[PDB]
Point group: D2
Chain length 332, copies 4
């Protein structure tokens, strides 16, 4: 009965697995594949599964990751427009939908990307009832909130791609300035991934040397020896890459593998990422925006309480108020 | 009370972890720690566990690894003489017991290591009765059979480390001869890990090209011009080495992680390991010896039925009979 | 008073970085960037330089990677129209110029890319004079040979990505039928990258045991397992995959990179990349083609002399004369 | 006739690799091997040299490592008692010596050991003059300094393992206290490696947030998080581990390999490693202790200019005195 029949001889009995650490990537767009080439690269899934709506573009992104199986450690790769392939996934990376046209704000994609999520979020929990979701599609913090509601999952099992990517954009500009590696530069961007984001100068530092101390001019526009512009650089930066190439992904893709490695390796390491911050720094409502969370195998199991300077909570309320003004009309 | 008390403001229930891929290492001797360190750097455990009777050193070793944790991806490293730490392990590596003295036959350790596996194996299955048991302690094939019989686990969940090593030495000795990577030469040693092993020359190949075809008097009573004395190299290799350094452990440490990697990441790759070979190559008893096997997330699930020449099946039957002879009296 | 002056007290006096592991990628398109990202996650380069005609897009991808830098182990990432950004490159990948149309042969792209290659390559070897060219652009064999003649480079130093990728498909396909990882299947496809690929069935083994002796009508017309349907699917591959998604890239971004591993790490393993085959199996002319060779830090230092069948050899003859028939016409 | 002749056909006529990231690890005891095994598993080296006066043992640790090759990416392992085998080396780790008996403090050692370095250090520079030298043997600053002189290498090429391990014990002990990864726990134990180290409590942060600027008791007599107790452990550590298992190797070994990664990858990350301190916080003696410092392919190339309080710099100076006192009378 072929070769498998009288070449392989079962010591067991056939046999099914049950995925252990499966991961669905939802969307096989420029972002969807970056995340996917990077999950596969760090060897993070025993099974990787693709769901997109474009059936043809899927079978071929599926097929393409398939051919390289021999360089990779992910026995099962799979793909369908039916969400039945995502069954029993441990982490689900949503990326699907429309992206910013050159100039367009992330926040002008809500109406549209919400309608996407209105369909795809609840088919994910049908198939993987006990998953962690990662939300990457834009209005990311607004949709992390939309995902939270529709999924009907705990808060520690719904995670915003957040300002993990912002904070690395930041630690990378700091790193150029200093001529070291960003692993060795520390410092944080919290709140809305994008325009309304907050630089926390209090905590910018290198080998413990607070630089809000080593120049308290730091962050104060006009004055200062340069720091204002670094934050603007981070903020503007999404737009500045879109002008030149069309979109971003190699950095988002790696951010996400980061997030997933921390979690599937149960490391409890710290990540600035979008969560529900009701009841912190004076916040009226159920607003999702990023803060230094502890990612382990549970999902995000804590936030970190920081002494912020007065101005930085001011900036963070302006953010959470913006986001809450779109979420209060949302109703689904 | 401690800063955790409100440096960390949880989003998930204090709650109840449970390790995914936990791994236990019964024994913290030279071999034992070799396995622990190789395991640790490939990052295969999200919990390591070290058992032993030497209660102090044991705690020496744990604390020493712990100190390294910054450089690993292993959140929990515990250790006690009490098989109550090993609870929930996906894999238990048993290096426990006595080893060779300068000269000593692996087969001569059987009475003593039997008597250990006797009062240790029920303790392993108590706290973890769905764990793949890797037997390393010698003689390894017989204690694989002894582990099977005491443990009540199925054939595919007791795996002797077997010829994964002999065969790596052989591929390396091969490679030496030719100027390439071990990985790029191929060639199996099956049989008793030790004196009576079998160089399946039929299969020795590079780029698919069969070297016995290229050298028909290979592995042959005198005539060849290099071969038999490599198999003689592969046999005496432990004895050559224990003599200069007291013991072996890095090689075998590293094999036991090659098997561990392929099982946890579910890769379904072929290793010659020690599995029950009744019925094969006309074998009438439940001997455990080494043959090409597929190891996946379930353990040892397949044996590759082979086309051994009339004197490979011969020398194979001869390792069989020799192990069964030492096995037949055990009677526990 | 530059923030560096204040924070970093130099010890070795000012930078002058000894480049070392430069890798250039020519052409930041789909393939270009699959190679790039795949190189980055294996930390093979400590400098990456991209080149391309498309000034905007090029700056975008450099930027995009840069931003990921925190997630990486590549200190420097640069990019520019000029070949001067590629100086000292230990290994350079040319992936630029046109590609298939839905249905178009790889050789139908020749004249176009030769004219690219004509003003790309001289430039490459002005600036990285001691380097290893890895030619992805298609047709990959004939372009490897055109690279060879123009660059002047020792022939070992011009490696075509060849049939590394096909055998990697052919090993995945055979892996599905058998239910093991591709790594544990073994089976070469040699020759031209396109439709003359030969699948050397002599070699096709698993754990030593030839799948031909198992089945001696392998890869002929009527046979039980229908082995030609695998080799045909391996030829069809690119066509099917493009038809669904406009290109292939990932699986090739992986192989380019798997080969680079073998070089920079100096492993001497055997890949079926493309190499000048004059001398071999009757071939009288300077033909590039894919035979199992050894890669190390010198590049392609040795071919494995295989013991191929009569029919199998004809086929190389087939392949080597379609290639040579294009090749001779080229205005040099 | 040689099978390498029937099988291998040389494309580049004449094999012979140029030396490259040859690393050497001096002495093959507990620390020797443990550094080695961690260097090998991080795929950092294409030539491992082992050196040691006990030939016999040394040819075993050479061999036990050679057998493991298949599982590695380090194509030449070699060992000999003549430092010839360490020619054209790039990094050389010095672990040879004698070590503390239970109770012994690290200065009991200088005499016997300084006869040790007096032998070897030249023989490094004799055979491998263009190198970085990592120093681990005790007493380790007093021998670092001893190495700077003997070798007569530039400041930036002689580094001691120094406080790296301590700040790793530190960051790990901190980790237990908050339940995150020592890699999200930031903190610096600087100065002399043994009893005299110095916890810079200002740096000690987590996620941007200063700890001292939260609980100002830190470091004094009776603090209520008990933090002088932590530094306490980071100091006692060595001793208390030596009481259980006679020595340490693993922690040290991984951390040496971390330096070796930083530097081969030319990564310019910071590491609390030992280096010449005069001109820093008022040293007048030619003496080495561990400060935050930048580790690329040039070696240690700069330090971090930090603001350090009285009772620390004091701590530093008495350290740097005791240091010189031994030193001054060193019949070089
Ligand atoms: N949060 C972040 O840090 C971050 C960063 C970069 C990009 N993004 C966002 O991620 C998204 C993806 O980026 P991209 O460049 O891959 O976009 P893309 O156009 O390249 O990909 C679109 C993908 O989503 C699918 N899609 C479109 N409409 C859909 C629908 N109704 N239902 C299901 N799938 C649909 C497409 O088939 C395709 O798979 C964008 O919205 C982008 O803004 C977020
Ligand atoms: N399969 C292989 O390729 C291979 C290779 C090398 C060594 N080995 C085996 O390793 C075993 C030990 O080798 P080693 O050099 O580590 O010796 P070792 O002396 O260094 O280690 C023995 C350890 O076992 C512990 N121990 C003894 N009885 C125990 C028990 N009943 N329960 C729990 N722990 C117990 C001891 O504390 C000691 O720490 C030997 O059987 C030897 O054959 C196997
Ligand atoms: N060997 C293989 O396994 C394999 C597989 C897939 C594709 N390919 C080949 O790879 C090549 C690239 O494929 P692709 O999918 O990236 O197409 P692509 O459209 O994505 O790549 C085009 C790139 O070529 C660049 N380019 C054109 N002229 C240039 C010049 N004169 N100097 C520098 N850069 C120039 C463009 O500016 C652009 O960046 C094609 O030739 C394709 O056929 C080979
Ligand atoms: N800096 C750190 O963080 C750190 C940590 C642990 C150990 N150490 C030091 O490392 C050293 C040994 O550690 P160990 O546990 O491996 O000791 P070990 O006994 O296990 O290793 C000693 C090795 O040094 C060799 N040696 C002795 N005299 C020699 C000589 N004259 N020439 C060449 N080699 C010689 C021996 O042959 C042996 O190979 C001690 O100095 C110890 O304090 C430093
Ligand atoms: O973060 C980005 O770069 C981004 N790109 O598209 N949307 C975004 O948010
Ligand atoms: O083969 C070995 O390495 C060995 N050494 O001691 N026991 C063994 O199995
Ligand atoms: O085979 C492929 O992947 C391919 N697609 O376009 N050129 C190629 O070589
Ligand atoms: O720090 C240590 O662990 C140490 N142990 O022995 N010597 C040392 O330096």
């Amino acid at each position: 009965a072929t070769l498998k029949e009288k070449l392989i001889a079962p010591v067991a009995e056939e046999e099914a697995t049950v995925p252990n650490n499966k991961i669905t990537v939802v969307g096989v767009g420029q972002v969807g594949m970056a995340c996917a080439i990077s999950i596969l690269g760090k060897s993070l899934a025993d099974e990787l599964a693709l769901v997109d709506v474009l059936e043809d573009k899927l079978k071929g992104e599926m097929m393409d990751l398939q051919h390289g199986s021999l360089f990779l450690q992910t026995p099962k790769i799979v793909a369908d427009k039916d969400y039945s392939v995502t069954a029993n996934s441990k982490i689900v990376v949503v990326t699907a939908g429309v992206r910013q046209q050159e100039g367009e704000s992330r926040l002008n994609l809500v109406q549209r990307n919400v309608n996407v999520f209105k369909f795809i979020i609840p088919q994910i929990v049908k198939y993987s009832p006990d998953c962690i979701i990662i939300v990457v599609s834009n209005p990311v913090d607004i949709l992390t909130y939309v995902t939270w509601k529709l999924s009907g999952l705990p808060k520690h099992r719904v995670i915003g791609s957040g300002c993990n990517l912002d904070s690395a954009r930041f630690r990378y500009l700091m790193a150029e300035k200093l001529g070291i590696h960003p692993s060795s530069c520390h410092g944080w961007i919290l709140g809305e991934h994008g325009d309304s984001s907050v630089a926390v100068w209090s905590g910018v530092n290198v080998a413990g040397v607070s630089l809000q101390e080593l120049n308290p001019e730091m962050g104060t526009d006009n004055d200062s020896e340069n720091w204002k512009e670094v934050h603007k650089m981070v903020v503007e930066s999404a737009y500045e890459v879109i002008k030149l190439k069309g979109y971003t992904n190699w950095a988002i893709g790696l951010s996400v593998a980061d997030l997933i490695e921390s979690m599937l390796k149960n490391l409890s390491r710290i990540h600035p990422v979008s969560t529900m911050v009701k009841g912190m720094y004076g916040i009226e409502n159920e607003v999702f925006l990023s803060l230094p969370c502890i990612l382990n195998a549970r999902g995000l199991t804590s936030v970190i309480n920081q002494k912020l300077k007065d101005d930085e909570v001011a900036q963070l309320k302006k953010s959470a108020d913006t986001l809450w003004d779109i979420q209060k009309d949302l109703k689904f």
